[PDB]
């Protein structure tokens, strides 16, 4: 029944949106190159350029829009007539017997009528070693409509009829199928769902669900018929496993309650999270076959199936939303090279889906294409500025680069602390050393191997070697100079104060981290 919902003049809007994107990129590059100083004074070896003003304006507008969306969501209340059917879809491969039980109990004890909620769990690898998950599923839902099937096959390898009738007629269903991947189980569940439900909620085998997540998502979906998908806030079960887990939790809060909120202000959320997400069933059934059979210019994709789901939803003119009243708890890596592998995978999926997302910019707000362009072009300018200031041959240059990076991080952390109302977000300033060391080389590693474990060590080694050589060259070249001149003396009176401030900031941040974590 739903259609593409194209605009009245698709070609004109396409042309003007592409022209706007090209003009924005050209203007940003011209402002970066020109280095035109706006505000200046003496006795200060730094100024505010047009590029810096543009970045500050972008940060200000993103913060303002996120705050406005959060306030609007908080103020409004919705009926939730409780007349819509929901299907909770869980996929499992080898989930820990400790996390799957929590997930199943959370799904069972959610706050939604039992005659409107139907739970389906699909398990990969019916090799007699994965029956411990079906047994636990049966144990959790002993006194309900339970249908369990072991399918010696798959949808892309009878069983199909039994699977479909069990999923569409029963309430709690557990299907075990041959191993095909995360896409295979999700496709099997979506196809077996049919037209038996109105909304399809997607979950993982590890996510612990809040009791109000389903009802809040249904409430936000029922308000407007234009909405096709919605997400929710995702928390972390283990924020104290290591230093990486704590930073990951802070980054999760930031990316969910600032970036995603700002995107949802214009109803153009780019990605719906895996653990929390609701989709309209009719649109999903429309685009399911196309979504399954998608390749990146001749290569199958096994990454970012939630980002691709959101892209498919957006490609039909249907807007995606975000609500913070629905919460869930997931698990994040606590070890290096594993968080690094996850970040590399996410960057690969984002780069691969950027080209597909660029096709449907005309159907949504101009903020979508603006943010896509700026987020795509920011890291390259980051690297160029870093290289130039590193190899400029002055110690004050690298010191000021570090100070500027930390100042931007501190501004973001202060805004996050004010928005959340809680003070732990000041430690979000510590993500600068993680982004500048691993994430930046990982972006280029993902870009150079877009078509495709101790492998991402090499980009880290190259980046570290380049940085160390640059710092050594700058130190050598400033060691061979005469500082008796009154210009290098003002440079010295800046260097001393900057170093003192930098060390003091590092000391207070480390002390605050230890105080907040140890207690």
């Amino acid at each position, epitope marked *: 029944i739903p259609k593409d919902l194209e605009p009245k003049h698709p070609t004109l809007w396409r042309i003007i949106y592409y022209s706007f994107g090209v003009v924005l990129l050209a203007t940003i590059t011209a402002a970066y190159v020109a280095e035109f100083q706006v505000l200046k004074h003496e006795a200060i070896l730094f100024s505010l350029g047009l590029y810096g003003l543009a970045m500050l304006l972008h940060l200000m507008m993103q913060s303002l829009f996120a705050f406005l969306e959060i306030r609007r969501v908080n103020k409004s209340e919705l009926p939730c007539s409780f007349k819509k*059917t929901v299907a909770l879809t869980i996929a499992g491969y080898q989930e820990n017997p400790e996390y799957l039980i929590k997930c199943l109990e959370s799904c069972k004890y959610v706050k939604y009528p039992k005659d409107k909620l139907k739970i389906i769990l699909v398990i990969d690898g019916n090799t007699e070693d994965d029956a411990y998950m079906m047994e636990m599923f049966k144990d959790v839902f002993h006194g309900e409509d339970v249908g369990t099937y072991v399918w010696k096959g798959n949808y892309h390898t009878e069983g199909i009829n039994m699977v479909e009738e069990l999923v569409r007629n029963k309430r709690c269903v557990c299907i075990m199928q041959q191993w095909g991947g995360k896409r295979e189980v999700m496709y099997t569940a979506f196809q077996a769902i049919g037209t038996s439900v109105d909304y399809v909620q997607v979950c993982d085998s590890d996510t612990k669900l809040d009791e109000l997540a389903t009802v809040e998502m249904v409430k936000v979906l029922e308000s407007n018929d234009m909405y096709g998908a919605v997400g929710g806030d995702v928390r972390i079960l283990n924020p104290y496993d290591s230093f990486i887990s704590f930073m990951s939790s802070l980054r999760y809060w930031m990316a969910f309650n600032v970036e995603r909120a700002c995107q949802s202000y214009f109803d153009c959320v780019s990605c719906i999270s895996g653990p929390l997400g609701m989709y309209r069933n009719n649109i999903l059934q429309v685009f399911l076959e196309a979504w399954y059979r998608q390749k990146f210019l001749g290569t199958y994709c096994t990454l970012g199936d939630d980002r691709h789901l959101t892209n498919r939803v957006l490609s039909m003119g249907y807007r995606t939303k975000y609500t913070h009243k629905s919460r869930a708890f997931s698990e994040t890596p606590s070890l290096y090279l594993r968080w690094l592998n996850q970040q590399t995978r996410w960057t690969k999926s984002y780069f691969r889906e950027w080209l597909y997302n660029a096709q449907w910019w005309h159907k949504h707000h101009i903020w979508m294409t603006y943010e896509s362009v700026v987020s795509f072009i920011f890291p390259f300018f980051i690297t160029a500025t870093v290289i130039r200031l590193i190899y400029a041959g002055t110690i004050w240059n690298v010191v000021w680069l570090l100070l500027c990076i930390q100042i931007m991080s501190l501004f973001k952390s202060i805004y996050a602390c004010w928005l959340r109302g809680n003070f732990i977000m000041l430690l979000m300033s510590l993500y600068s050393m993680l982004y500048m060391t691993g994430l930046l080389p990982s972006k280029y590693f993902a870009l150079l191997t877009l078509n495709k474990n101790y492998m991402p060590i090499l980009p880290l080694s190259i980046w570290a070697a380049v940085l160390c050589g640059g710092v050594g060259y700058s130190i050598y070249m400033d060691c061979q100079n005469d500082w008796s001149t009154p210009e290098k003396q003002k440079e010295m009176y800046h260097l001393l104060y900057g170093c003192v401030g930098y060390v003091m900031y590092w000391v207070i941040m480390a002390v605050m981290y230890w105080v907040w974590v140890k207690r």
Partner: antibody
Amino acid sequence: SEVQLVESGGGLVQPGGSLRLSCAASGFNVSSYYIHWVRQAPGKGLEWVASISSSSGSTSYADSVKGRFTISADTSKNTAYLQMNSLRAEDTAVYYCARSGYYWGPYFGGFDYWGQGTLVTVSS
Amino acid sequence: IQMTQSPSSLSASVGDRVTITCRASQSVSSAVAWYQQKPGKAPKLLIYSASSLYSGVPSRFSGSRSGTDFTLTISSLQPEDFATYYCQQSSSSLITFGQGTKVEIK
């Protein structure tokens, strides 16, 4: 434990009085299934009377039943109840009890595990 | 809403394939089920969702739908198959039963 449904409270009653039939379930929980009351007049076809969904409170009746009859379900005894007041001479039939699943769409599942019949006679 | 069974009374021998047609004016989001009942006994479920077969029912019974019409077919009529067959259009807030279609013998 095999699914069984037993009926109680049927008999003779003068017109205008009241009756309380009871449907005792065994082998399952009424909170995970629908409970329907179906009656068959002497020498006639089946007629649906009322339906109750426990843990949700959804009750449905018929045009010739609504207003007079009430349906409930007690989970402390794991039974269902049908209270018929303002009985008429036309309500004499054999009342059954049926179990079913839930309504999702074009798929329902059916009326599996029918109970026995209890006889109600409204006459002078 | 009205549910009409086409053959009110049907007679066939043993081994005869017999079909029963059932018409309902409300076929938007309501499932159609087919039940069988014998004298002095509670009805038993034969077919649900207008095509699926209940566990334990012999594979001779089958169900089909063609637009508004719903059909129940018995390929071979065994002596134990003589009973009264009923339709049911069951959705929330309204359930409607069919009537008649008593299968007899010559």
